[PDB]
Design a protein around this nucleic acid. Sequence first.
DNA 1: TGGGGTCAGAGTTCAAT
DNA 2: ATTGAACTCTGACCCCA
Lengths: 75, 81
Amino acid sequence: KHICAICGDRSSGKHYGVYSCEGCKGFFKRTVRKDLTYTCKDCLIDKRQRNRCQYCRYQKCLAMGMKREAVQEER
Amino acid sequence: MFTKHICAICGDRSSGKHYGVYSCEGCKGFFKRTVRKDLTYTCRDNKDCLIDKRQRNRCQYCRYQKCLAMGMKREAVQEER
DNA sequence: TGGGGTCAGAGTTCAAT
DNA sequence: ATTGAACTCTGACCCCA
Ligand SMILES: [Cl-]
Ligand SMILES: [Cl-]
Ligand SMILES: [Cl-]
Ligand SMILES: [Cl-]
Ligand SMILES: [Cl-]
Ligand SMILES: [K+]
Ligand SMILES: [K+]
Ligand SMILES: [K+]
Ligand SMILES: [K+]
Ligand SMILES: [Zn+2]
Ligand SMILES: [Zn+2]
Ligand SMILES: [Zn+2]
Ligand SMILES: [Zn+2]
């Protein structure tokens, strides 16, 4: 699948268990690494609006099956 | 089979010896790559970074010194086919 | 075996915002 | 600080004698 399951943008392969784009991959990574927590509870997450709501973007990452445990230690 | 051994370097599972030492597939691949390209690394800390399964990639310098300390032989790495 | 190889999916960088 | 396009590294899983 070459469509990001989260935002619908063109996809880069599987990442953390989900067909996703580099943006959603990088966003999920940073969210898990820094243990970040956001505040919005169901905004639209597509390509153009993906950055508009960090809370909803991260919730959808999880809802599409992204695995926190797949984010490794910073090297 | 993997029942018999663990990696002398990081403690992950091992199916046997590589370059002279019971090691996992990761430390095997890591040691090979380091030698093949003659890579030099640097440690940001005190040259005693903990090397286990979770932390092994966090300092390549320390991972490499431990490969040597445990007995891995650079000369066992062959030329790239 | 214990040498070899591959490449998906982890990693990172850094210009642009 | 944050994003994401475009890179490098890793290691599970193969191939052989
Ligand atoms: Cl080194
Ligand atoms: Cl370091
Ligand atoms: Cl560990
Ligand atoms: Cl990173
Ligand atoms: Cl490297
Ligand atoms: K492969
Ligand atoms: K690749
Ligand atoms: K860059
Ligand atoms: K890997
Ligand atoms: Zn996406
Ligand atoms: Zn929202
Ligand atoms: Zn190891
Ligand atoms: Zn170190």
